[PDB]
From Swiss-Prot:
It is found in: Nucleus; Chromosome; Chromosome, Centromere. Belongs to the SCC3 family. The chain holds residues 86 to 403 of 1258 of the full protein. Phosphorylated by PLK1. The large dissociation of cohesin from chromosome arms during prophase is partly due to its phosphorylation. The lineage of its organism: Eukaryota, Metazoa, Chordata, Craniata, Vertebrata. Component of cohesin complex, a complex required for the cohesion of sister chromatids after DNA replication. The cohesin complex apparently forms a large proteinaceous ring within which sister chromatids can be trapped. At anaphase, the complex is cleaved and dissociates from chromatin, allowing sister chromatids to segregate. The cohesin complex may also play a role in spindle pole assembly during mitosis. Cohesin complexes are composed of a heterodimer between a SMC1 protein (SMC1A or SMC1B) and SMC3, which are attached via their hinge domain, and RAD21 which link them at their heads, and one STAG protein (STAG1, STAG2 or STAG3). In cohesin complexes, STAG1 is mutually exclusive with STAG2 and STAG3. Interacts directly with RAD21 in cohesin complex. The cohesin complex interacts with the cohesin loading complex subunits NIPBL/Scc2 (via HEAT repeats) and MAU2/Scc4. NIPBL directly contacts all members of the complex, RAD21, SMC1A/B, SMC3 and STAG1. It is linked to Intellectual developmental disorder, autosomal dominant 47: A disorder characterized by significantly below average general intellectual functioning associated with impairments in adaptive behavior and manifested during the developmental period. MRD47 patients manifest developmental delay and mild to moderate intellectual disability, usually with delayed speech. This is Cohesin subunit SA-1. It comes from the Eukaryota. Residues 208-293 form the SCD domain.
Length: 315
């Protein structure tokens, strides 16, 4: 409206366009997901755009095969002023999109399924542009969802505390209206959480377990950095010897860029003298490799390995 009204409401272009997207999604899910699909196509530098008939009548594999042939250096690799901020922005868009979809649309069975199937689809593609763009998207997606899960946890605790000061208040008395709503609320919140955990699995099994060993080092680096973020944010789901092995197996990686990332991940874990216990078996299993890298070959990898080992000593 007025200039005062806009400035006091710093809605960004992103937030603005994610708000427009959500309205458009509510009128017509199809055209809205078509636009979200094309957006992923166009962030790869792919010059094609999918039409509704394709969308309505074609499997992602088909769509992907067709957009593959329409490939002319993609937005994520360009240098220049007019692409400096792109990666930062692509990453923020996926966090804004989900943050905003997190109460209704996320839990529909159509939006997140379209997106994740398309991101899995592009992360199999022989085109680097597709693998790099989709995987960075999938990794930021997983994190957006882990945030959704952390918000749910907080609501699950308020709904659990609240169900307790009602269950106790009755005892002997017929289960009333409040105790049936709360006992439902609690069921919803847990089913909501299952849905998130489901999406996390499709993204992890479908994209992460294949990409972290990607031929391109930048892609392996995108994966490691992010599994590090999951393990710190959401320890109980993500900090365990199955997920950690990924990080362990990748200390042996060939590129400084990636070894550096494995160490930065383990650093952020071992600083928290609280999940320090949950790294016991992992410290035993990979101490020889962590310790070896202190004289790594690449100065700044070594510097970090040293900072890691001192962090471990201190515990």
């Amino acid at each position: 409206g007025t200039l005062f009204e806009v400035v006091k409401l710093g809605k960004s272009a992103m937030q603005s366009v994610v708000d427009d997207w959500i309205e458009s999604y509510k009128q017509d899910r199809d055209i809205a997901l078509l636009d979200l699909i094309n957006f992923f196509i166009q962030c790869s530098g792919c010059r094609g755009t999918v039409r509704i008939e394709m969308f309505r009548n074609m499997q992602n594999a088909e769509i992907i095969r067709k957009m593959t042939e329409e490939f002319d250096d993609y937005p994520l690799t360009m240098p220049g002023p007019q692409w400096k901020k792109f990666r930062s922005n692509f990453c923020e868009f996926i966090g804004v999109l989900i943050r905003q979809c997190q109460y209704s649309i996320i839990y529909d069975e159509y939006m997140m399924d379209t997106v994740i199937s398309l991101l899995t689809g592009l992360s199999d593609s022989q085109v680097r542009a597709f693998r790099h763009t989709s995987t960075l998207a999938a990794m930021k997606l997983m994190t957006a969802l882990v945030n959704v899960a952390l918000n749910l946890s907080i609501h699950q605790d308020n709904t659990q505390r609240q169900y307790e000061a009602e269950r106790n208040k009755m005892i002997g008395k017929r289960a009333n209206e409040r105790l049936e709503l709360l006992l439902q609320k609690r069921k919803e919140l847990q089913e909501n959480q299952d849905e998130i955990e489901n999406m996390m699995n499709s993204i992890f099994k479908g994209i992460f377990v294949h990409r972290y060993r990607d031929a391109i080092a930048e892609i392996r680096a995108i994966c490691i950095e992010e599994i590090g973020v999951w393990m710190k944010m959401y320890s109980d789901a993500f900090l365990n010897d199955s997920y950690l092995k990924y990080v362990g197996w990748t200390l042996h990686d060939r590129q400084g860029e990636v070894r550096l990332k494995c160490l930065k991940a383990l650093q952020s874990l071992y600083t928290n003298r609280e999940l320090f216990p949950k790294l016991e078996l992992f410290t035993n299993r990979f101490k020889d490799r962590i310790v070896s890298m202190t004289l790594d070959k690449e100065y700044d990898v070594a510097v970090e390995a040293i900072r890691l080992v001192t962090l471990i000593l201190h515990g």
